[PDB]
């Protein structure tokens, strides 16, 4: 536990060469009034100052609770130092808060998201896989005090679900699920094949943040859809029984999609001017779950599936942050 704590704290030290030098540079050139005369410069300094400020308040805990621990924590935990060992619980909490902060703060990360789950090849098996995936995300939402709004659900004929599109709203939703987005691989002995040979099926997970008058048509099938024709992507809703609400819901999803199409394209263009495989796998035979990206493996698949692993997500988030 102590070792773990130390490790955690080491990350915090990792942002000491950033904070000091940066701060010095800012005061030396940016703080100046004759530099200030240009707005852009001022803005830059403010951004730079923000970095400094984060490092100030949260490092104290790392330093202050570390140095004061060892004198009283050494020999006694149970008698007289039962406060003094769970005094470092506070430190742990602080550390966690810091880490989480580092992970988040990035563009659109607070605004809720609407993940579509798409199956892969396998046909019947694949649909089941999709369903399973959906279930896990639902449980994650449940776990994390969220409220899920079920928009698209479409059953596959032989078994399972073909297509789904599920929208959760609450406290930093997108942030958590934004990494997941991509292919999830189901490496397990099919219940449908009599042979019981191991199979591999897949699932895309499209995850997007939530964020014309004659070039859209709205058609009823009490069901509803909002087909923005110029781009050419449709959305279809079936959540509520009341029509107007459903329509409204559809509208927001479509809007989100529009934004998504724009932003990614723009980014690509910029890159032009200037993962390969599955992200995750779940290997039920082996009781074994490798995220291929970020090199973590959980050995209780069931736990992961029942309710999605926050820890894994955090790791993924960290990786994403680093890449950013």
């Amino acid at each position: 536990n102590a070792s773990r704590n130390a490790w955690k704290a080491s990350g915090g030290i990792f942002d000491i060469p950033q904070k000091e030098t940066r701060l010095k540079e800012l005061e030396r050139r940016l703080e100046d009034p004759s530099l200030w005369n240009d707005p852009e410069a001022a803005r830059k300094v403010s951004q730079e100052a923000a970095r400094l400020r984060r490092t100030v308040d949260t490092f104290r805990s790392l330093e202050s609770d570390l140095q004061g621990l060892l004198e009283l924590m050494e020999e006694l935990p149970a008698e007289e130092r039962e406060a003094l060992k769970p005094e470092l619980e506070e430190a742990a909490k602080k550390l966690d808060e810091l880490y989480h902060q580092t992970l988040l703060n990035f563009p659109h990360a607070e605004k809720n998201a609407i993940l579509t789950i798409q199956p892969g090849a396998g046909g019947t098996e694949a649909c089941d896989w999709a369903e399973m995936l959906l279930r896990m995300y639902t449980r994650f939402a449940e776990r994390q005090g969220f409220q899920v709004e079920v928009v698209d659900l479409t059953p596959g004929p032989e078994a399972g679900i073909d297509y789904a599109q599920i929208l959760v709203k609450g406290e930093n939703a997108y942030g958590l699920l934004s990494p997941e987005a991509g292919v999830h691989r189901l490496v397990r002995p099919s219940p449908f094949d009599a042979s019981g040979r191991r199979h591999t099926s897949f699932a895309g997970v499209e995850v997007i943040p939530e964020v014309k008058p004659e070039e859209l048509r709205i058609d009823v099938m009490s069901a509803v859809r909002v087909v923005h024709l110029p781009t050419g992507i449709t959305v279809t809703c079936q959540t509520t029984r009341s029509q107007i609400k459903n329509k409204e819901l559809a509208l927001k999803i479509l809007k989100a999609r529009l934004y998504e199409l724009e932003r990614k394209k723009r980014e690509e263009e910029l890159k032009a001017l200037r993962w390969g495989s599955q992200i995750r796998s779940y290997v039920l035979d082996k009781n074994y779950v490798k995220d291929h990206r970020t090199g973590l493996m959980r050995h209780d698949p069931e736990n992961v599936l029942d309710g999605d692993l926050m820890d894994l997500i955090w790791a993924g988030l960290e990786w994403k942050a680093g890449r950013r």
Partner: peptide, 12 residues
């Protein structure tokens, strides 16, 4: 405290 204002007084 040079970061908040600092050389504004030192403009003169």
């Amino acid at each position: 405290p040079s970061p908040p204002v600092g050389p504004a007084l030192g403009q003169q």
